[PDB]
Amino acid sequence: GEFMVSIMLLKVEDLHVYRGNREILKGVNLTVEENEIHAIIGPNGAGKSTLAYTIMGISGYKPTKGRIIFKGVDIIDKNITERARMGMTLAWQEPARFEGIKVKNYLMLGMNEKYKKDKEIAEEKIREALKLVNLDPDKYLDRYVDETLSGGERKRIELASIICMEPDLAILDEPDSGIDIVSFDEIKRVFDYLKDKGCSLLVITHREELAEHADRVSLICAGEVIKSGDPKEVGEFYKKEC
Amino acid sequence: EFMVSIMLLKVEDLHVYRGNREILKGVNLTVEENEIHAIIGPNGAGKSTLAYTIMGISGYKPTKGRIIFKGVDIIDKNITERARMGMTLAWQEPARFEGIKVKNYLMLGMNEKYKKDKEIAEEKIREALKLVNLDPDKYLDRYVDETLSGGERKRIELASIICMEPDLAILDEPDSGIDIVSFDEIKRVFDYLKDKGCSLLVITHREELAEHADRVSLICAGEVIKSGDPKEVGEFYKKEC
Ligand SMILES: Nc1ncnc2c1ncn2[C@@H]1O[C@H](COP(=O)(O)OP(N)(=O)O)[C@@H](O)[C@H]1O
Ligand SMILES: Nc1ncnc2c1ncn2[C@@H]1O[C@H](COP(=O)(O)OP(N)(=O)O)[C@@H](O)[C@H]1O
Ligand SMILES: [Zn+2]
């Protein structure tokens, strides 16, 4: 291979986002490459979740200045459904509970077409995803994705949902939240498995254990990317300056 | 010189069944007056279930054993009866009570020693926000709703505990959603609460916070496996679990 190029999957250009009265994002320049794990670190109120919501096109999160480019398309006038059709997904910090929806049915919703095309393949995929996040398929398939699950179990089911979905870009807002340490290698193996399939993860995290697993980390302070690059160097700068 | 000694909280061989599964299988746990007792352990071990059973949350009734708070068996007392005795619970993922400003939220539940004088209560709310690093002038008139970030809502919940100043504050992951550059402020909140005579029963996944407790208890499959020194119990957890 002669040329060494980099492909951009997502490009956030000088993004200014106003929430209510306050200016949360003040010119964010962020890129996500194809098959890359890009972690976003920073203090509370810096605008990390707001950045994820603006990329997903959550109602109310429209930029006043700048633009979001996904797969070379300017997605500014596209609703959350139009962005999800292109291969983008968001995992919330506290995922929704649903009465009456079983775990098997929830993991089937959003499953990649390459698995849905054959019933037996889709059933094996759900079992594989639960085993990846350390949940016994025979104990959790019949459970409901409701208030009965513990936060850690719900967070693992959300991660299994991403495996089945196999999206082009998975934005994960604190995928570690509520999950015990000891289970942190399983989270890294999920990220590795997703990278192996061609996925790109944009992970917001407070765990250095997970942020150091990314290929690139970006520090965000007061709606601005302060530093970006090596996970350990950017992490050390965070723990000392901003 | 008064020999009458009363244990703040005493959980005796507690067996709790949730749905079909037996979550707690004989829990023996005690909380002393003016003590920070951390509870560590893997997911599904029953730590949150233990906190909900102590608070008397609807559906969390024990099949065997008993819960004794301030020498009183609270088994037949509802969550409101337990809260009047000085017990409180800070849920992991707190409620967004819309149409209620942060000033009203912090005033609901405030300790009587502060409510008795309007000026004292107004200074208490400002003090609590400053303790959790929130600027009172920026957050006092804000609404507790989805507008607040998880870290901000978790800090407001901690400020609420300062104003309340309870005898026993059960905190289910008080660190969750809070950045690591603010973990000293969480420890200073625990110190401030201990200084006032409060006892905290903190469930946590951060060794940073669990090592700040006077005693840590490891729970595995509804059972206390080890208890005592925070560093020794913490090392045993990473090793065997
Ligand atoms: N409607 C609104 N009115 C006022 N302030 C608002 C708002 N919606 C959001 N905010 C504020 O904007 C900031 C955005 O925080 P967030 O993007 O969640 O920060 P983070 N996840 O990186 O911790 C927070 O300080 C939040 O309270
Ligand atoms: N109604 C229910 N049916 C079945 N299982 C139930 C249940 N309510 C709770 N559980 C289970 O109880 C277990 C205890 O979870 P929890 O007490 O939150 O554990 P933890 N805080 O230490 O992470 C979990 O594995 C959960 O799935
Ligand atoms: Zn027993």
Author numbering:
A (entry chain C): -2 to 239
B (entry chain A): -1 to 239
Give verbatim excerpts from the published study on this entry.
The present study focuses on the ancestor SMS from the hyperthermophilic archaeon Methanocaldococcus jannaschii. Biochemical and structural studies showed that SMS is made of a SmsC2B2 heterotetratmer wherein the SmsC subunit hosts both ATP and [Fe-S] cluster binding sites. With respect to the six components of the SUF system, SMS has only two components, SmsC and SmsB, encoded by the smsCB operon. The SmsC subunit, consisting of a RecA-like domain and a helical domain, contains all the structural motifs of the nucleotide-binding (NBD) subunits of the ABC ATPases (i.e., Walker A, Walker B, ABC signature, D-, Q-, and H-loops).
Incubation of SmsC with excess of adenosine-5′-[(β,γ)-methyleno]triphosphate (AMP-PCP) led to SmsC dimer formation. The SmsCK45R variant was not able to form homodimers upon AMP-PCP binding, consistent with the notion that binding of ATP is required for dimerization of SmsC. The interface between the SmsC subunits is weaker (the buried surface area is 730 Å2), and likely susceptible to changes upon ATP binding and hydrolysis. Such a conformational change is supported by the structure of the SmsC2 bound to an AMP-PN, which exhibits a “close” conformational state, similar to that observed in many structures of ABC transporters. The SmsC subunits rearrange again to transiently form a tight dimer as seen in the SmsC2 structure favoring ATP hydrolysis (intermediate 3), after which ADP and Pi leave SmsC and SmsC is reset to engage into assembling a new [Fe-S] cluster (intermediate 1).
